[PDB]
Amino acid sequence: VHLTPEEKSAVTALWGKVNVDEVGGEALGRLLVVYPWTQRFFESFGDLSTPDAVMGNPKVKAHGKKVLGAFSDGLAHLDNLKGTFATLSELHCDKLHVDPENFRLLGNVLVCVLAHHFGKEFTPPVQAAYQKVVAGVANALAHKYH
Amino acid sequence: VHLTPEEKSAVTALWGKVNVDEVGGEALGRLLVVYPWTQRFFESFGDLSTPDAVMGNPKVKAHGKKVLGAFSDGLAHLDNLKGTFATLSELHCDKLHVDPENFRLLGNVLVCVLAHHFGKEFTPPVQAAYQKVVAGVANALAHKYH
Amino acid sequence: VLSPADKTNVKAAWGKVGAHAGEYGAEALERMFLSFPTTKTYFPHFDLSHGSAQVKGHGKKVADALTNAVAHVDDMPNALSALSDLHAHKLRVDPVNFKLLSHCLLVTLAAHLPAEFTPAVHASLDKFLASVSTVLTSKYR
Amino acid sequence: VLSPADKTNVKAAWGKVGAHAGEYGAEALERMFLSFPTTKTYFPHFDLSHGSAQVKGHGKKVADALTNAVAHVDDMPNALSALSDLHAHKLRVDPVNFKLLSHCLLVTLAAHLPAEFTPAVHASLDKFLASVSTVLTSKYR
Ligand code: HEM
Ligand code: HEM
Ligand code: HEM
Ligand code: HEM
DSSP states (O other), X not given: OOOOHHHHHHHHHHHHTOXXXXXXXXXXXXXXXXXXXXXXXXXXXXXXXXXXXXXXXXXXXXXXXXXXXXXXXXXXXXXXXXXXXXXXHHIIIIIIOOOTHHHHHHHHHXXXXXXXXXXXXXXXXXXXXXXXXXXXXXXXXXXXXX | OOOOHHHHHHHHHHHHTOOTTHHHHHHHHHXXXXXXXXXXXXXXXXXXXXXHHHHHOXXXXXXXXXXXXXXXXXXXXXXXXXXXXXXXXXXXXXXXXXXXXXXXXXXXXXXXXXXXXXXXXXXHHHHHXXXXXXXXXXXXXTOSOO | OOOHHHHHHHHHHHHHHGGGHHHHHHHHHHHXXXXXXXXXXXXXXXOOSTTOHHHHHHHHHHHHHHHHHHHTTTSHHHHTHHXXXXXXXXXXXXXXXXXXXXHHHHHHHHTTOTTTOOHHHHHHXXXXXXXXXXXXXXXXX | OOOHHHHHHHHHHHHHHGGGHHHHHHHHHHHHHHHSGGGGGGOSSSOOSTTOHHHHHHHHHHHXXXXXXXXXXXXXXXXXXXXXXXXXXXXXXXXXXXXXXXXHHHHHHHTTOTTTOOHHHHHHHHHHHHHHHHHHTSOOO
């Protein structure tokens, strides 16, 4: 994905300020409340009935931490995304059967969580940068389908 | 795209019976009636206001003939689809700005036109084959975006 | 949403289907399972072979629920309220799979009512099925 | 469709936006043009630089049309009938581009009303915008 040095500076700067414990927990928490059918995948995480149960679940926050870890890995190697997310594209496709529209949903919920945390620091130029990242990551994590 | 010799026999047999004048004209005609926003791309083809005007337009039928030609070309070389639809992916992306959800719409309208013509000859096994073709062709004609 | 011309077309064209609704419903499900085999996972306990009585029975039900919907095409969220409760709360079908069963119904009609399948009917029947899909994939009441 | 709990949430949360509707509408359009630049092509004659009076004016209008929609959240297709006639018949905006302006409004609210943006509000405001998008991309009356 083609980023200029100003965009890549913005991405890395505001990524450096992220609290990498809570963000993944929030992002994945919001996903399960806003796009309910996604719950069907995590029915092994116990109670997910009321927004407060989803945000209060320890496994959700736990699993969230891994997801944001995987975004961080993929933000390191922007040059080679298909090589990075190889086993995951296999994982999410051949076993779980998560259809690829759901990836670009998770990406957009992420960007809403970041603007929530960084308030006015999340400017349009920064947003435009991160939109290109989470496109790549989604578009690359589902190429085993096609 | 992975086709078995039975599927490829079915594809080529029922493709052999297609009247390659009218089908493209019908398919593209239906597209403009069922997904109206698509008209914005062909506003240079004059009157498109009433279903009868769209089906009665000569340029629509004319342009349709080329589209089905391009499907025929891509059905020849199933092994190498990305090499085939190289200039078109550039054409439809970099100049016209047709977004890639519209490709999988055209593909599905095509399959409805074929079942309309071949009636009961269009069986589930045949359908399953053609669905894999028009997926490939759509998924390959829009890789210049990602 | 749905024009008054489209409401007529749906009533008329679904009238011509009439009493083969069971059979068309079955054939639709059958095309869908073959074409998009990841859709099977919602039916783990069915016997999804060729010509099973389970599938043929299920298709009857679907086809009848759609007949009911066409009867009340004006106040649809009340009519389809038990189905929404099933497909949306309990089963959690995601709305992509509605787009494939709606596609496989239109292929089936076009392969059996060739005369009644003019563009204007295609255009209306597509909107109708799309409305229905939206009621069943949401949590209201 | 829209639960009675979601209708409340939309009214309450859009109430808290209140009188900065002009500014939020503008910032939404501005993020959208930067993020997804193929959306510009619908506005060929505007001056889409930073801080243009044209864009700031347009955003006022959008934001007001949405305020009107929230007033009549129960009978929405009548209220939004002139807009549908514009975005659907004349302009022929395709419905993908609604999903980007709806996204860029939520980012904008979350960056300005952090306290009011709980999951339940996020969930409702998403459905609301989605309904509105569907009325404006269809030909009825
Ligand atoms: C878009 C970026 C995404 C990334 C980077 C990502 C990353 C990951 C990673 C690293 C794992 C491995 C954790 C494990 O060992 O279980 C995983 C598992 C999983 N992901 Fe994702 N994922 C993404 C999107 C999605 C979406 C959209 C869904 C569902 C709608 C989903 C559902 C799951 C599930 C169900 C598992 C396995 C859960 C388990 O075994 O406990 N993922 N994901
Ligand atoms: C999915 C398979 C598709 C194939 C195989 C296909 C094929 C072609 C080909 C071969 C041309 C070149 C004709 C020329 O020189 O103008 C072309 C042009 C064009 N296509 Fe497509 N196309 C597809 C989908 C679409 C879709 C979905 C749209 C719009 C929604 C579209 C809109 C156009 C337009 C506007 C032109 C140029 C029209 C003109 O210059 O007169 N195409 N297409
Ligand atoms: C498009 C219109 C659809 C209609 C009108 C419809 C209608 C129905 C009806 C009336 C039932 C109740 C039958 C019963 O009580 O067993 C039912 C059950 C069911 N439907 Fe649907 N359905 C539709 C789409 C879908 C789709 C797309 C899926 C999955 C891909 C699905 C999966 C199911 C399942 C799993 C059941 C329960 C079957 C069981 O109890 O074993 N439906 N449907
Ligand atoms: C999501 C909710 C939307 C609302 C509530 C909305 C509302 C409005 C309103 C009230 C007007 C009338 C202003 C006037 O008369 O000039 C308008 C005009 C317009 N809207 Fe929208 N709109 C929305 C989405 C979109 C989108 C997604 C696009 C394109 C990507 C778009 C493109 C336009 C254009 C081109 C005009 C005409 C501007 C002109 O006359 O130069 N709108 N919109």
